[PDB]
């Protein structure tokens, strides 16, 4: 089913982001953002590549298939031949169309799941000092620079370095 | 998979609700509830209608299929004919039953996903002033009337109108 | 100072059918269906075909005298008839088991 991220609680995509599928947008003391997340997008590329190659290699190529000839006293066999060809053609066209239609919902839900998990990870490693504000943005009670940005990105945040100082600012706003 | 809402953290359904699939139940100063959510249920109706029409239009109708006749020296061709008919019949009955069995889990998980997303939306636009209490209910520290009920329903809540007053009552209970 | 989390967007216009929806605009896609062909008749693996022209298979094996051009041919990949191949049997009659001979001939 729909996991709720793409065109969900997160609004439309980012045109300005180029080198990936899933990324961040940061505004510390000296810049704006648009950096991609090269870890998760590589797993997505691997999954999709394996999927397409599997769908290609399940379908065998056909060899030579040439029509046959019958005279006017072999109408019965000729109708049988036509029945066999039309039956197999209907079966294969059904299989092809149905396979593509199911595979498309599978892949769109796969991307949706990736975005939701990439959001939950960032939320989980910023437990207290964040104050999420809407459509997947956070806001750092403490002060952050480029190093803590990369520290968030990699997945190594070390929360107890900042845990006291944030607390002060939180009690300032409350 | 199972998204966890229907017969999950939310208990059984509402018999008293009529005009939709997903709705609300409110108890402000002057009434009880059971109003439907006409936005999401319309998307569900559109999806299911397109699904059923797609499943109908993938199956081609058959034209005239009449049995054939053979004498006592054409047993070989007769067995071939019977083999062709039984083979195609087995293939089509397999495809029909398997298509229905997979489509049923797909549609039940689709409804389950819709209920979970409709819960997450209401939670997200009532960040501080709610105090959720169990099986998908909220409880408004501030005071609400019919206008803020519709304000929740449409998706236009304007939280900073109430954000201070709620805070007072919250500190009363703590 | 913030982090926001989002996803890629583009200016692509290619559409994909799905079960719950029709004409979905996707960012990247791949085709799985061939349409294009030349108008030519080339040779399988570097061996030329054999074009009967205005001649039939019966006319070629019997040696119908108007099929005098293709008298020295002895190797091919496949046999091409046209819609004007009529020179088959000049003296009238009936080639017996003509179709079985055409089926034996498709393995030589």
């Amino acid at each position: 089913g729909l996991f709720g991220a793409i065109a969900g609680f997160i609004e439309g995509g980012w045109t300005g982001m180029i080198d990936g599928w899933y990324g961040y947008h940061h505004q510390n003391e000296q810049g704006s953002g648009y950096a991609a997340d090269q870890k998760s997008t590589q797993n997505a590329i691997d999954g999709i590549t394996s999927k397409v190659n599997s769908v290609i290699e399940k379908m065998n190529t056909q060899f030579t298939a040439v029509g046959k000839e019958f005279n006017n006293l072999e109408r019965r066999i000729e109708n049988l031949n036509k029945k066999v060809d039309d039956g197999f053609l209907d079966v294969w066209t059904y299989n092809a169309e149905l396979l593509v239609l199911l595979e498309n919902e599978r892949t769109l839900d796969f991307h949706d799941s990736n975005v939701r998990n990439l959001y939950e990870k960032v939320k989980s490693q910023l437990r207290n000092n964040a104050k999420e504000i809407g459509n997947g943005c956070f806001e750092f009670y403490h002060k952050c620079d480029d190093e803590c940005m990369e520290s968030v990105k990699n997945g190594t945040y070390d929360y107890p370095k900042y845990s006291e100082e944030s607390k002060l600012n939180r009690e300032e706003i409350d | 998979g199972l998204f966890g809402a229907i017969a999950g953290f939310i208990e059984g359904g509402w018999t008293g609700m009529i005009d939709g699939w997903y709705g609300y139940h409110h108890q402000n100063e002057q009434g009880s509830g059971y109003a439907a959510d006409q936005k999401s249920t319309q998307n569900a109706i559109d999806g299911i209608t397109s699904k059923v029409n797609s499943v109908i239009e993938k199956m081609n109708t058959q034209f005239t299929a009449v049995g054939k006749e053979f004498n006592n020296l054409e047993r070989r061709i007769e067995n071939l004919n019977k083999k062709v008919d039984d083979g195609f019949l087995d293939v089509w009955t397999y495809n029909a039953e398997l298509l229905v069995l997979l489509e049923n889990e797909r549609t039940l998980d689709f409804h389950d996903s819709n209920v979970r997303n409709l819960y997450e939306k209401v939670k997200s636009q009532l960040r501080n002033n709610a105090k959720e209490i169990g099986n998908g209910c909220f409880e408004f520290y501030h005071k609400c009337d019919d206008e803020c009920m519709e304000s929740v329903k449409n998706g236009t809540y304007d939280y900073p109108k109430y954000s201070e007053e709620s805070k007072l009552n919250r500190e009363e209970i703590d | 100072d913030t982090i926001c989390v989002g996803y890629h967007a583009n200016n692509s216009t290619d559409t994909v059918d799905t079960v719950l929806e029709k004409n979905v605009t996707v960012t990247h896609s791949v085709n799985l269906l061939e349409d294009s062909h030349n108008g030519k008749l080339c040779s399988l693996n570097g061996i030329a075909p054999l074009q009967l022209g205005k001649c039939n298979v019966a006319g070629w094996l019997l040696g119908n005298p108007e099929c005098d051009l293709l008298l020295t041919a002895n190797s091919w990949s496949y046999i091409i008839e046209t819609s004007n191949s009529e020179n088959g049997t000049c003296y009238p009659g009936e080639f017996i088991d003509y179709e079985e001979l055409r089926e034996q001939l498709s393995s030589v």
Epitope: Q30, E139, Y141, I173 | - | -
Partner: antibody, heavy 122, light 109 residues
């Protein structure tokens, strides 16, 4: 209707201090970022400072680091900018302006004040 | 710091004509450019944001165009009140928000 009134100008000795104030009326004040933009006499615009909607993010221009602070009060709906230890080249007309959106790409400043004058000389 | 530059410095024009104005960035902002006009002794006002979308309550003779590093403001007709000063602003990579340098607009006789 949205208007931004502002005050706190006047001639001040070099090395002094001010506290300009911009009072907003016509919108929900606690859901938009605000910015201060000055203009030297007979020159172009120049950005000075910015405070976010929640008040958790403050940014200043590079030339005015450490000498300026900014704060907001929700109850009075009032934006304050505190200036300390001025110079001769801070003589400008100061404007309080409103961010059009609440994202990072805010999309221009739709509403503006009317300008208070500040002269620093001896 | 993205540095903006306007061109030309001063455009003289006769009434009943159009005009074109160029703003050029040192780096590639995507579409995050806005324009403003300023009368003498007035507050600025928002004309055109996102380089395409005109602001609410703007007459339709104003037009904005461009992407990448070069942007263009175009005025179709004049009625002698549009002679003002024009500024361009990027908001792609702030802080610090950077404005242009202004191009005044004169009557030609």
């Amino acid at each position: 209707e949205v208007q931004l009134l502002e005050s706190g100008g006047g001639l001040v000795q070099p090395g002094g201090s001010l506290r300009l104030s911009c009072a907003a009326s016509g919108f929900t004040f606690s859901s938009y970022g605000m910015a201060w933009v000055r203009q030297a006499p007979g020159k172009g615009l120049e950005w000075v400072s910015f405070i976010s909607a929640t008040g958790l993010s403050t940014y200043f221009a590079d030339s005015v680091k450490g000498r300026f602070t900014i704060s907001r009060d929700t109850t009075k709906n009032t934006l304050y900018l505190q200036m300390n230890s001025l110079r001769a080249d801070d003589t400008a007309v100061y404007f309080c302006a409103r961010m059009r959106r609440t994202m990072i790409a805010f999309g221009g400043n739709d509403f503006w004040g009317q300008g208070t004058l500040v002269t620093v000389s001896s | 710091e993205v540095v903006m530059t306007q061109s030309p410095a001063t455009l003289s024009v006769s009434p009943g004509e159009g005009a074109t104005l160029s703003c050029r960035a040192s780096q590639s902002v995507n579409t995050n450019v806005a324009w403003y006009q300023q009368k003498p002794g007035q507050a600025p006002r928002l004309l055109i944001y996102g380089a395409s979308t005109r602001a609410t309550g703007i007459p339709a003779r104003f037009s904005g165009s461009g992407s990448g590093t070069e942007f263009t403001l175009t005025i179709s007709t004049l009625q002698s009140e549009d002679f003002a000063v024009y500024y361009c602003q990027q908001y792609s990579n702030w802080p610090p928000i950077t404005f242009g340098q202004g191009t005044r607009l004169e009557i030609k006789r």
